[PDB]
């Protein structure tokens, strides 16, 4: 049980992480941060680094605090052009051990009619978001993640609909919906709630 939990933890950690390649040599950490921040709060960026030539190696790993953020980045950032060059995005490379759990967690997410919303402007409240998103169906809950130390929300949250059709409609329609002067990023849950 401690072993099963550990494998689960290791799988969720992999799912929070996005490989980014073909980074133009003139670009760096900042450009990656700005380009990948819309999908959720970035826990860290791990730049490739040649410690002899003191240059990055054209790739990096972006680590999100929530797996759906990494999912959105994976789905929406391939063939994005930064500094004149198409970047490449993928899941981390050594994940054979974790892939069953990744797939299990995505199958288990389905029953909850659960969607993830990022790039929520600070001016907007949970009820602002709920009111916009309840156009698609009746919403069982609508919770913006909040930083406990500050009380302000973290620009993302989750919505649970009563009907699966509703959550599917919201996802198809509301990715890049303009709200609060920012483009929302929206996608399905990739785990059951925890």
From Swiss-Prot:
Q: Which residues carry this modification: N6-acetyllysine?
A: 138
User: Where is the PTM Phosphoserine found along the chain?
Assistant: 131
User: What does the UniProt entry say about where the protein is found?
Assistant: Nucleus
According to UniProt, the tissues expressing it are described as: Isoform 2 is expressed in colonic epithelium and colorectal epithelium cancer (at protein level). Isoform 6 is expressed in colorectal epithelial cancer but below detection level in colonic epithelium. Expressed in heart, brain, placenta, lung, liver, skeletal muscle, kidney, pancreas, spleen, thymus, prostate, testis, ovary, small intestine, colon and peripheral blood leukocytes.
Q: How does it assemble?
A: Homodimer. Associates with the spliceosome. Found in a complex with RO60 and Y5 RNA. Found in a complex with FUBP1 and far upstream element (FUSE) DNA segment. Interacts directly with ERCC3. Interacts with CDK7 and GTF2H1. Interacts with SRSF11/P54. Does not interact with ERCC3 in xeroderma pigmentosum complementation group B (XPB) cells. Interacts with ARGLU1; interaction may be involved in ARGLU1-mediated modulation of alternative splicing.
Task: Indicate the disease this protein is implicated in.
Answer: Verheij syndrome: A syndrome characterized by growth retardation, delayed psychomotor development, dysmorphic facial features, and skeletal, mainly vertebral, abnormalities. Additional variable features may include coloboma, renal defects, and cardiac defects.
Record's miscellaneous remark: Does not repress TFIIH-mediated transcription in xeroderma pigmentosum complementation group B (XPB) cells.
| The name this protein goes by in its record | Poly(U)-binding-splicing factor PUF60
Please give the organism: Homo sapiens (Human)
What gene makes this protein?
PUF60
Describe which stretch of the whole protein the shown chain covers, with first residue, last residue and complete length. Answer: 114 to 307 of 559
